[PDB]
Structures are given as structure tokens and as C-alpha cells.
Design a protein around this ligand. Sequence first.
Ligand SMILES: [Cu+2]
Ligand SMILES: [Cu+2]
Ligand code: NA
Ligand code: NA
Lengths: 619, 619
Amino acid sequence: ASPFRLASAGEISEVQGILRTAGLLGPEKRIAYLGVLDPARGAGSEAEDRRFRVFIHDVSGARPQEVTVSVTNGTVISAVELDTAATGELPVLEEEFEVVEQLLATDERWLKALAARNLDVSKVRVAPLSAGVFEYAEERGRRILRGLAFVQDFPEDSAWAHPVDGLVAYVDVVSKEVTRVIDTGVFPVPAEHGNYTDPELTGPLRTTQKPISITQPEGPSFTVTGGNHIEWEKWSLDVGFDVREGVVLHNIAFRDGDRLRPIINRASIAEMVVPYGDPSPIRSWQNYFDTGEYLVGQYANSLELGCDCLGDITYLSPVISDAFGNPREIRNGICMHEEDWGILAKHSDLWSGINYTRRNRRMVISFFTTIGNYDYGFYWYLYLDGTIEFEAKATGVVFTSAFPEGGSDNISQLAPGLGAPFHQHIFSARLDMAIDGFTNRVEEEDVVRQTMGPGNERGNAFSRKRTVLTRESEAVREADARTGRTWIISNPESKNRLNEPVGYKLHAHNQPTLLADPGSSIARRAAFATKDLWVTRYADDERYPTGDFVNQHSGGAGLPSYIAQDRDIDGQDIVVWHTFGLTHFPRVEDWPIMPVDTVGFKLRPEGFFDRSPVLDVPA
Amino acid sequence: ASPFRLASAGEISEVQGILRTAGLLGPEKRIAYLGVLDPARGAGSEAEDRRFRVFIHDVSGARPQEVTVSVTNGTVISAVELDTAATGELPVLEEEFEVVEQLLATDERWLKALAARNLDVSKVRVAPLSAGVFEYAEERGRRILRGLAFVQDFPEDSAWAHPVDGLVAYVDVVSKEVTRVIDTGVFPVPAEHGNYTDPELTGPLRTTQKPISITQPEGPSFTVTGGNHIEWEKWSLDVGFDVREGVVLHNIAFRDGDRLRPIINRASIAEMVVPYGDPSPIRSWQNYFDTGEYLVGQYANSLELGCDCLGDITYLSPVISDAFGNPREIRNGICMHEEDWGILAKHSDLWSGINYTRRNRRMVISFFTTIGNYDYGFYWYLYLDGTIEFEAKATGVVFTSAFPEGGSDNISQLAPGLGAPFHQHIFSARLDMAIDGFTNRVEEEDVVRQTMGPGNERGNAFSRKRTVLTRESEAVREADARTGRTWIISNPESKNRLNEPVGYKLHAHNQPTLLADPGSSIARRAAFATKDLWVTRYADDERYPTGDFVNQHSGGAGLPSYIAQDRDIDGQDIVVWHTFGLTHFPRVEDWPIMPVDTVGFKLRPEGFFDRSPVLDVPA
Ligand SMILES: [Cu+2]
Ligand SMILES: [Cu+2]
Ligand code: NA
Ligand code: NA
């Protein structure tokens, strides 16, 4: 049955075959993206129709294609050729990661730059970095990667410790040409190593940590059926996985008495971008759309018991497509477990004599991905009391540069001569809402201060106000932490027992949004990142805040284009897009490998239930 | 020696003896507050002088006294008679809690009000509520409590379900007189029970929760010596307890290689206020200073193992004085344990082939208190990476009223006829800083956006600015979440290996501050709560942001009086006072007992260390 089940190896093999039998997957075609499409609204009435969507690159310079395949019926639904100058280049291929270095190695300008700095070409690593769109007309319609160099002194050395500043290369990865080499002058290559497993650097390892054992002698309190259907403590959902988005949650619902009450139809991180704030021309083009350009799902780590996920862990091993359409398992790529979460509720009553304490817990669904130097953990949490939460954990090794003599307004010093350019990591959560079903609306809620006077003679009164967002033109909102601003998603046709519409309230962290000048390329390409909250009317083709093809795409698609339709969102099937991020001025403590920092958001029931939903939790 | 050790029963009995001997503690005297004072600045080769401070009330009507005793030397250092109309009343005595109901039960006016509502006086509980300072001139110099009524249908009933609105009384608890009874008219007394252990309301309890077992087979990784000295994962500190503030942390330091580096000299929650936002005369005077008026420490719960604190727990059982100067232990009043805290750092490197994962942990020091309907947990956390965090957990039963027919801008509906007035819970954390010692300064750090143009041609640059707070007059600061504002405490005389002053950065949650009109009584009495950050020059008598005597005390003391001294704070012994709070518009999910909500802050190292301090953590 399960229409939201994870893709199996078989379905992927069959997409490869169907694409073969049908003539679209030659020996020169490469899959840049493959994933199952979600069912249509109201599709549960008719029979299962598993469709997969595919982006196909061509190594022989031919135009790429977007293809939809039906694996259920063994047919092709559509296949269109893409003008990439128009609608964007395909996502970077894993096989292109090595190509920037290989091409530069025999390029005379590059070799000249390395010789001036007395660097052995055999020891120079080149990061394959997304190009974006700037002043270079030659790049339009061409598939470009840019290259920044880092020295690896030996095979096990951390090359990030040795950035080669003042040097950047542009490369065409289809034609296999080097379009430009820019050498603005030599900077000293930082000499200290950053090898965080070298005893010389770590000193003697601590012997003071005694073990902590977390076990469940009767197993976990959640069940997994149909491969990926979870039931836990009144919650019901399906855990999806997509090579672009990573972990995606479907059909988040809560069993309240004898009713399964939908809350969120689909929850995902639909984009994440890392814009850099260093005006040096060596790095001023740097903006990594890890989700849209690189595909974070594909680089999900195989997590290890005791190390990555602690306790009684149930794993999912999602299957994805390699470049040729063969299925590939990411073994132990998703962790699922429950954990204790301190006190849930507590009261000791003088008058009744009753003392009462209950413990909280949360269900955790997580994965961890690695993109070059960065490593990100994505964690979804469901709590006993109906709260839903997302948390990103950022770690890895910070992206480095030289530290200028005389300092910098845009770069931090990490070690002698070693800099870390300022940057942000900004996420977009796409929450296809379904609060008690699909007829939903959003209100912006602010605290309202009141003036001392008639009706408030002691000057103690305070209140709040709610403003319905009625149309998409009114639905691009900013934070206001000072007035306690939140957004409530409600169902105006579903009332609780006090005759008030059922709702969930989104609580943001109110961290800074995109800092770049509004006239910049990145402000246009990551327009979603300039505002905290967006609400659109649901449409099946409006999946990402940056559009389907982000790589080397100017503005023209994504949220600003969707919002322009100015559709009714007052009691309709709607989607909330929440921007949230970390603004990182790297500190010495982040080097040579960074301690986790976090950002996230949560939603809490707001008159969704008729009383506390956790009165039936036992002592 | 340990001069920061917890007060012992013997010391408290000895204080009693000294006071008795001195003629200060005859049969009409009551101890309203008793606490050990911290050692003086300096004090090392100087031997121990354990001094206690005592507030002594007199039940016959005589003026109270403030007394300092040297228990070491058997002497009275100072004893001063207090004019309470000027300097404030002493904190509420536990013995006064019952007095409000007792006196009202035989008052003709109160009895008439109850008879008008067909309520049996035997069933009417009266909350003993702090009075504040309003328009009632006869209250000046008198110890007053105000009384709000709640019906208890039977001994084990939750009275909070049955508020008696439209009625309030004021009582002189020393003369035992009812000064006023105000009845503005009958409201229906809400009829539904709120008995969260009654099977009729909870329904069948869940049988779905499988055990989670947290154990440490080798015991915990921290040690406790001298009764209250903790050593854990390079951290060192002393855990104090005061009847007013509760848990107080002293001498927080970190052992970095061979050197014990101070960070925070003293950390405490020095005040917490709960202002109500309902303009009804029945409650418009309601502002509970749980710390300054009630003394949160004295109501600290005994914490049951496996229920309140889970895992391998080490308890402290602090000793306090009763009303007569006899010692009273709070058994298992403070929990101490370490817990797993997920991933600390992780990187899988493409060039080096090294995959690296480490786990985080935190040390937790906590207590839980109960003040009438409210229950608060105070949690301090120390992390492997140098981060220090505080979290408050708010739970209990919400303070109720009638819900007006036709609704309310200042009260939420919870059940039929039952309301919950809007309010805030606002904390002041007093952090007597000692970043690498006492010579410290504070900078306000904002993100700085840059305009596209010369030097920033692509409009990607962003920066930050730091502004030193040089004198107290410029050290009253507000949040700016939009600009990512934080505050850095540094030592201008202690540099890290990159020649930068060592520091810690305070990260606030940027929740709304005090909402009351600035002309209100509460804005003057809780002036600290109007601004997010204050910095003072350390002084031994500047302990609380509201002064020593808050009960029925107007403005004139506390932080605004301290700041007026305009002292140098630029490389001096300074104290940071951070305001942070929850603004609570109660939801139906909060009833009949509220799920925990949280608020807090953290400080993270900011070039304090010369590189990551957790490179020596093992796999
Ligand atoms: Cu970063
Ligand atoms: Cu509250
Ligand atoms: Na929706
Ligand atoms: Na200080």
C-alpha cells in the first residue's frame, strides 16, 4: 500500500531501465538528480502511481533534460530539453569535484602561480566551488566551477590549514577548459597544521570521562511499519528521504482520542545557503547553496552506533541513484530514537496536598551530511506535549583564507597568518501546513503595550494583536523580537471546545537574515533569505524557495516569482517558508575543527487541543 | 578550609546563640532571612571569617532589624533598626501564608461577599499575595498581604479551577486586622474541576512508554570535595545555596593546561518578577517577586530519584534557618549530574580520508521551587567546550480568574467560565564577572551591514562593530535581535596567542522585556526588567537589582540607584545583570497543569582559548 514509502533499489533500477528501454539513458548521460514525486492531492482514492523525477546531464555538451518517469506502469510521462542560460544549470556532480584540480594541474597560468609561491602541484588541493552569476558574460549557458587552492603536506594532512590566498581559477567542466586564472599577488600560506588527531596538537587524551549508558531494556516505544511509517506517543508520520532535501517528514499527525488529526503535510529543509562576507575578489563571489547546488542528501554520512547516535537506535538506510542510475544504499543514513527530555509538568500543591511530577520525552529523526569542509546535522523532534522542533547542528572545519597584515573588517584570525572569512548559514524550512486538514490561514501575532490612563489606571495592562495574512502580496514578513512576534497557523473551520479556531504557533529564534546589500547577486538569488517568513498558496511545482535549478541561475524563479501570483491564502491550502540562520564570525575556538553550534525553530499547539494533551502520561 | 562551603546546621544554631546572647532574638522575634555572606575581596592568608546576614522581624509590632554576625568570632558586627516605610518591609514569612484566610474567615464583609455567591467559608482558600505599593496611604509602614479567593470542593481538589472573581481583601498580618474588602460584583465561579490525577479527566493512562535507563557503571565523571566543590572536565566551581536566590555558583574556572583560569566569580538569579497584565482592580496590583518577596530558596523541593532527576545523581541537602533560628535541612534539594549532549564535533574529510566524531556532555546543577500555584526549575549547565548556560523551566498551575462574558483583551479562556490573565515571568541573572581575573570590560557587538560600492563592488561584505561600555551611565543596554547584538566580557590585560583580549560572549534570547507603562508602580519597582543588560562596578552591598527589601517598597533602591554612581567599568571589577523573561498568554494546553516552558541565556568563549579546548576529548 504505502504511497509515501521510501524508494527501493528496485524502483531505481527500473527507472534506469525504463529510461533505457525508452532511449534517454545512453552511455554518455549522467543523472544529476533523481527522486520520487509525492502523490497528488486526493490521490489516495485512485491506485498507486509512483512517479520519479530526473535531471540528466550530458558529458558530450548536449542540452540537459528534465524527465518524469512512471515506475508503476513502466512508462515515461515527459522529457523536456533545458535551456540552462534560461532556467539554470543542473546541480554539481560528485564526479566534477576532482575535475577542477585535474584541469588546473596542467594549466600554465596556474602552474606559474604555484611556482611563484614554491608550492608542489602534487600537494595542491582545489575545492570545487559553485560559481554563481556575476560579470562574466562568457559563463552564461556554460557549466562553470571556481577553484580555491589549499596545500596538503601529506596524505593525512588537513589542507584547510594551508589556504593559498590571492589566487582563484574559473573552469568549464564540460569543455574541460580553464577560462580564467586570477593572481592578485602572493600571501604567505599559513604554516601551522590543523591535524586534530595529531597527539602533538591534542596533547594527552583525557582519561576523566566515565561512561554513560543509555538503554531501553524493552526496546523503543515507537513502531516502524511499511519501512518508514512511525507511530510514537500519539504521533504518526512517514519519514521520506530525497537526495536534494535529505530527510523529509510526511503526514505529521496526532491521535487525539479517536481522531487522527493532521498538523503538517510535508516538512523539509528546502534550501540552505552559505554567503561569504569578504569583499576580496578571491572570495567575493562565494555563496554555497548546499541543498540546491550540491544536494545534501547524497552526501549523508553512514552513522555509527555509540559515536553518532547514542541509545537504542533504529536506522533507515535510504537508497539513491549514482550517476548512471544504479541504486546505492546509504547504510545507516537516518537515525530514529526516543530520548528523555527532563520534566514535563510539575506541581506541589499546598492546599490539596498532591505532589505531581511527570517526565518528558522526544522522538528524534536525524541525519548528518558533509559538503567539503562543512558538516551539518539535521534533527527533527516531536515532543509529548505536541511541540514540533527542528534543529541544525553546524560543525566541520571552517573555510579559511590568509589573515591580512594589519587586520580585516571581514575576516577573523584563527592561527598565525590564518584567517576565516565572515559568513552566514541560512536555512529555509518548507512547511506544507495541514492544521486539522488543509483549510488553513496564518496570522502575525505581536504583543501590544498599553498606555496608562482610563481603563488602565495602574498602567499594568498588556495585550496582543493578530493580523491575518489574506493574500500572498501581504505574506512576506519580518521578525520583531522586541514585540514577541510569532505566526499562528490555524484552521478557521475547526474549532476547539471553547469555540476558538485550532492553531499552532511558530516560534522563531529571530537571528539575523541575509546581510548582503539588496542589490547584490546573492540577494536576488537567495531572496528567500532576506525575510523571516513567507506564506504561499500550495502548488505542486513550487518545491524550493530558490527554484528547481539554482546553479548559475540569475533571479527569475523561487519565492519572489511564486508570491507574485498574489493568491488567496485566507482559509486555503498553504505553505509556510521560514528562513533561519547562523551568522558566523569565526572564533579561535572554532579551529582546527569546530564545536557544534545550533539554530532552529519550533511550533507549539495553540488552542489545538481542548486541554493539556499529556494528562494521560503515567508517573 | 573552604570559605565557600555550604552553611552547616551547627553554624545556623551558632548564629541563633549569638543573636540570643546579644539580646536580638527574644520570643517575639522571627528570622525572615538568614544567609552566609561571601568572603571579602582579597582574603587568602587572612584566616576564615564566616559572616551571616539576618533580617529579624518582631511579631509585637516593634521595628525589624538587619544584623550581621561573625559566627567564627561569636560577635555581632552590626545591628540596625529598620524604618520599613522608607527602606521596605522584610520578606513574607511562611507563617503569614495561613493568616490571610484565617482573618478573613471571621470578617463580616468577607462573609457577606461569600454568602452573596453561595460559597461555604470552610471551602474558600485565600492566596496570600504580596501587596506592592499603590494608592492606599494607610499601608505605608504596615506589613500587608492581599487575598484572592479560590473554592476547594473537597480536600484533594485543585482550588485554582474555581477562582472567585470580583472580590479582593487586604490584611495587616501583624495587627491581625482586615483593612479593606472590595467586592465589585459576582462572577460565576467556574465549575469544572482541574484534578489532573482524577481518572475521569486523564482517561486511561498510557501503557505505551517503554523504559529509558540512564546509568553510569563506573560512577560520575565529576568529584565533590569539601561538601560543595565540583571538579568536572576541566571545570572547577563551588555550589552555594541561599534562601533568597537559591543555587548560587561561585568561582567558576577552567583548567587550561597548567593554569586555573577564572571565568565567573559569582552567578545567581538575583531577582524574578511575575507582573500581571489584567487591568481589573481585582488583580491590577499583582506583581510577584518570587525571589525578593517570597525567597525562592526556602521553598525548594525535595527532589525524588528517577522522578525529578534521572541518571546517576549526586544530591546536596542545603540547610536553612526556620523562623526561630533553628536549622532545617532541605533533603535532596540540589541535583548534580552529567549528561550526554549529542555531537560535539564532527568532520569527514575528502582529501585526508580521516573521519572524526566526538560526543558532547554537560554538567547540570539544578533545583526546583514551588511558590503557590507556580513551580520553577533553575538549571545551570557547563559544557565541554567552555559554554556556560542557564535555563529556567516554568510549570505549575496557571493563576486563574473568571473569563468575562464577551471576552477579554487581557485574559485567555481555559475552560468554561475560566480565565487566565496575561503575565510575564522575568528573571535577572547577576554575573559577577572574572574573565581571567577581575580586570574586565564589556563591549556591545552588533552586526554591520555594508553598502555595495567602492571596496564592496559585489555588495556581499558584512562586518561587525564593538562599542566599549566605559562608565555605568552608558551601560544600560537593550536587545537588538535584528542586528545580532551580543555583549562580550573581556580582560583587556590578558591576551590569547593571537594578541587579542580573551573574552566570553553573552547570547540572549531577545524576549520582550517589561511591558508595563513606564509610569506604573511595577516599572519603578522592577526597573531592572525594563532593559536587557546592565553593567555595574562591583560593590559588596549591591546584591539584588531591586535592593535588599522589595516587599511593599517603592522605587529608590536597586540598579537605577547603583548606576547613578557612574563608576569606571573599563578594565575594572564588574558585574553584568541580564534581564530575560517569558511573556505568557495562557493557552488551553496549559490547563489544568502546564507543560514546561523555558527561557535562559548562555555565554560562549570568544578568543578565551588559543584553539578549541576539546581536542583532547577521546573517541
Ligand atoms: Cu560557519
Ligand atoms: Cu506564566
Ligand atoms: Na498546506
Ligand atoms: Na567582577
